[PDB]
C-alpha cells in the first residue's frame, strides 16, 4: 500500500494531531508500507524525508497547486485526511481528491455542531469520505446520525514501551514528591488555575513538593500568581519527546485539571504507559481513558479543594497508588500502536481495491 496522509497543522509545535500522524506514518512504514505526509511548512523542526510541505498559510495559490500535484503524482491507494475543518489543508485535499478517502475526526463538541457541519454546504465533500474514523463512540454515533453511513471508533495510539522503559530524569524520583502538569498552561481550559489553587493545601502536607510543568508559556505570570509558593514550580520548557517520556516516568503523579475542550485524553494515556498514577478533571474523555475511576482518580471539574485532596490522597496512600498504576498498565495496551494501527489498516483495506487510485477531482 501507498498511503497519502494530510496533517492540517505545522509540525513546528507539538499537538495531538501532529504527533498522531507522524507516529502512524512511522508505524506503517515499519510494516512495509510507503507513506507520504503532507502538512503546512514546518521549517523549525527536523522531519523525515517523506514529509512534504503544503506551504505556509497567510492558504494561497502555490498551496492549491501543491495539493493537486501531490495527489496526481502520488499514486495513492488510500488518502488519509486528519481533521478536515473548513478552511484547512485537509479540507483542501478533500475537495481536490476523488476515490479511496479516509478521514479521522480528532475533535468534536456537540451532536448539533456535528449534524450541521456534516449536513451543511460542505456535505458534498464530506460524502466523498468512504472510511470515517471518530475517536469516541458518542462522536461516531453522531456522524452516523448525520450522514446515514457507517463510521468507526478508533482511539489515538501511543508507543506504550517508550514510556514504560523511559530513563528517569536525574535526581528522580524525589522524596518531597513531584506532581506533573503537561500543556499550554495559559489557556484557561488546561486548568492551571485549579492546580495553582490546590498548591497551598498540597504544600502544607508535602512541604517539599515540586510541580514539574511541561509546556510553553509565561513562567513570569504563573510564578507571580503562585506568590510565596513559586519556589515549588519547576518549568521544563517545551522539551523533546524522549525527555517528556522521562519526565512522566519520574513524577509520582500526573495532574490533568483541564476545564473542557478535550476529545481524547492522550497525555493521560502517556502517563498510564509510563506507570505514573493519574489524577484527572473528569471530562467525558478522561472518564473513558481512566474507565470510571478504575485506572485513575477522577476529580470534579472546577474543584480546587477536591483536587488538593485527590493528589494528597494519592501521594500519602502508597497501596492506593500502586493499584492505580498496575490497573492502568494492564489497560493502556488498548491504545498501543499495534492495536490501533491494525484497526486503521482494516479501514484502509475496506476502502481500497485492486488497482484503484486516488485522483484529482
Ligand atoms: N515533546 C513534547 N510533547 C508535548 C508537549 N506538549 C504537548 N505534547 C504532546 O503533544 C500531544 C498533545 O497533547 P496536548 O498538547 O496537551 O493537546 P493540544 O495541545 O491541545 O493538542 C501529547 O502527545 C503530548 O505529550 C511538549 O511541550 N513537548
UniProtKB/Swiss-Prot annotation:
GO terms for cellular component: plasma membrane. Changing residue 106 to A: Loss of mannosyltransferase activity. Its EC number is 2.4.1.345. Keywords: Cell membrane, Glycosyltransferase, Lipid biosynthesis, Lipid metabolism, Magnesium, Membrane, Phospholipid biosynthesis, Phospholipid metabolism, Transferase, Virulence. Its cofactor is Mg(2+). GDP-alpha-D-mannose binds at residues 9, 16, 184, 189-190, 239-241, 244, 262-266, 270. GO terms for biological process: glycolipid biosynthetic process; phosphatidylinositol metabolic process; phospholipid biosynthetic process. It catalyses: a 1,2-diacyl-sn-glycero-3-phospho-(1D-myo-inositol) + GDP-alpha-D-mannose = a 1,2-diacyl-sn-glycero-3-phospho-[alpha-D-mannopyranosyl-(1<->6)-D-myo-inositol] + GDP + H(+). Pfam families: Glyco_trans_1_4, Glyco_transf_4. The keyword Kinase does not apply. A 1,2-diacyl-sn-glycero-3-phospho-(1D-myo-inositol) binds at residue 18. Gene3D superfamilies: Glycogen Phosphorylase B. Its main location: membrane. One of its GO terms (molecular function) is GDP-Man:Man3GlcNAc2-PP-Dol alpha-1,2-mannosyltransferase activity. The record marks 106 as: Important for catalytic activity. Involved in the biosynthesis of phosphatidyl-myo-inositol mannosides (PIM) which are early precursors in the biosynthesis of lipomannans (LM) and lipoarabinomannans (LAM). Catalyzes the addition of a mannosyl residue from GDP-D-mannose (GDP-Man) to the position 2 of the carrier lipid phosphatidyl-myo-inositol (PI) to generate a phosphatidyl-myo-inositol bearing an alpha-1,2-linked mannose residue (PIM1). In contrary to PimB, the mannosyltransferase PimA is unable to transfer a mannose residue to the position 6 of the phosphatidyl-myo-inositol of PIM1. Was identified as a high-confidence drug target. This is Phosphatidyl-myo-inositol mannosyltransferase. It comes from Mycolicibacterium smegmatis (strain ATCC 700084 / mc(2)155) (Mycobacterium smegmatis). The lineage of its organism: Bacteria, Bacillati, Actinomycetota, Actinomycetes, Mycobacteriales. The gene is pimA.
Amino acid at each position: 500500500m501507498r498511503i497519502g496522509m494530510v496533517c492540517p497543522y505545522s509540525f513546528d509545535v507539538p499537538g495531538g494531531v501532529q504527533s498522531h500522524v507522524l507516529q502512524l506514518a512511522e508505524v506503517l512504514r515499519d510494516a512495509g508500507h510507503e507513506v507520504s505526509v503532507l502538512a503546512p511548512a514546518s521549517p523549525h523542526v527536523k522531519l523525515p524525508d517523506y514529509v512534504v510541505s503544503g506551504g505556509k498559510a497567510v492558504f494561497g495559490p502555490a498551496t492549491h497547486r501543491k495539493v493537486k500535484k501531490w495527489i496526481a503524482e502520488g499514486d495513492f491507494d488510500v488518502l488519509h485526511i486528519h481533521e478536515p475543518n473548513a478552511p484547512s489543508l485537509s479540507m483542501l485535499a478533500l475537495q481536490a481528491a476523488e476515490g479511496p478517502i479516509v478521514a479521522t475526526f480528532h475533535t468534536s463538541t456537540t451532536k448539533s455542531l456535528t449534524l450541521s457541519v456534516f449536513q451543511g454546504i460542505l456535505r458534498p465533500y464530506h460524502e466523498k469520505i468512504i472510511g470515517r474514523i471518530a475517536v469516541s463512540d458518542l462522536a461516531r454515533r453522531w456522524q452516523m446520525e448525520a450522514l446515514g453511513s457507517d463510521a468507526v471508533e478508533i482511539p489515538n495510539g501511543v508507543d506504550v514501551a517508550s514510556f514504560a522503559d523511559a530513563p528517569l530524569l536525574d535526581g528522580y524520583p524525589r522524596e518531597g514528591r513531584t506532581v506533573l502538569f503537561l500543556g499550554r498552561y495559559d489557556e484557561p481550559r488546561k486548568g492551571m488555575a485549579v492546580l495553582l489553587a490546590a498548591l497551598p493545601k498540597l504544600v502544607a502536607r508535602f512541604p517539599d513538593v515540586e510541580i514539574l510543568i511541561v509546556g510553553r508559556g509565561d513562567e513570569d505570570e504563573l510564578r507571580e500568581q503562585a506568590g510565596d509558593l513559586a519556589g515549588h514550580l519547576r518549568f521544563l520548557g517545551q522539551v523533546d519527546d524522549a525527555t517528556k517520556a522521562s519526565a512522566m516516568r519520574s513524577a509520582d503523579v500526573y495532574c490533568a485539571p483541564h476545564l473542557g475542550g478535550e476529545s481524547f485524553g492522550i497525555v493521560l494515556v502517556e502517563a498510564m504507559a509510563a506507570g505514573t498514577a493519574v489524577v484527572a478533571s473528569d471530562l467525558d474523555a478522561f472518564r473513558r481513558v481512566l474507565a470510571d475511576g478504575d485506572a485513575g482518580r477522577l476529580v470534579p471539574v472546577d474543584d480546587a479543594d477536591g483536587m488538593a485532596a485527590a493528589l494528597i490522597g494519592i501521594l500519602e496512600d502508597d497501596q492506593l497508588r500502586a493499584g492505580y498504576v498496575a490497573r492502568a498498565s494492564e489497560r493502556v495496551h488498548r491504545y498501543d500502536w499495534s492495536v490501533v494501527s491494525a484497526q486503521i489498516m482494516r479501514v484502509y483495506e475496506t476502502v481500497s481495491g485492486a488497482g484503484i487510485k486516488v485522483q484529482v477531482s
